[PDB]
Swiss-Prot record:
Domain of life: Eukaryota
Record-annotated membrane-spanning stretches: none
Quaternary structure, from the entry: Part of a complex composed of MSX3, CREBBP/CBP AND EP300/p300; the interaction with MSX3 decreases histone acetylation activity. Interacts with DHX9 (via N-terminus); this interaction mediates association with RNA polymerase II holoenzyme and stimulates CREB-dependent transcriptional activation. Interacts (via transactivation domain and C-terminus) with PCNA; the interaction occurs on chromatin in UV-irradiated damaged cells. Found in a complex containing NCOA2; NCOA3; IKKA; IKKB and IKBKG. Probably part of a complex with HIF1A and EP300. The TAZ-type 1 domain interacts with HIF1A.
Name of this protein: Histone lysine acetyltransferase CREBBP
Gene: Crebbp
C-alpha cells in the first residue's frame, strides 16, 4: 500500500543513513552513502536547520526521527537519534 511503500522507502533510506554514519570511509562507492554523508554534513553546517525551515535538514531530522522510533539502541552512531530518544 502507498503508506507501506513509503515506510519501506524510508527504512531503506535509514539503512543507507545507518551505513553511512558508521562508514568512516570517504572512499566508499555507495552513491547512497555519499549522499547521506553530504546531507549530514550539509545539515550540521546549515545551523538554520528547522529554524530557517531548510528542507534538507528537515528531511534528515525526520529520517532520524523515524529511525529513532525504530532504534531502541540509546547508544547509536546516527546523529540526533540519541537526542530525540531522550527528548
Ligand atoms: Zn559507505
Ligand atoms: Zn540546511
Ligand atoms: Zn539509532
Amino acid at each position: 500500500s502507498p503508506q507501506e511503500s513509503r515506510r519501506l522507502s524510508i527504512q531503506r533510506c535509514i539503512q543507507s543513513l545507518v551505513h553511512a554514519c558508521q562508514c568512516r570511509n570517504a572512499n566508499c562507492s555507495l552513491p547512497s552513502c555519499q549522499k547521506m554523508k553530504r546531507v549530514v554534513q550539509h545539515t550540521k553546517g546549515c545551523k538554520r536547520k528547522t529554524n530557517g525551515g531548510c528542507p534538507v535538514c528537515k528531511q534528515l531530522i525526520a529520517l532520524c526521527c523515524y529511525h529513532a522510533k525504530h532504534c531502541q539502541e540509546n547508544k547509536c552512531p546516527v546523529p540526533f537519534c540519541l537526542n530525540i530518544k531522550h527528548k
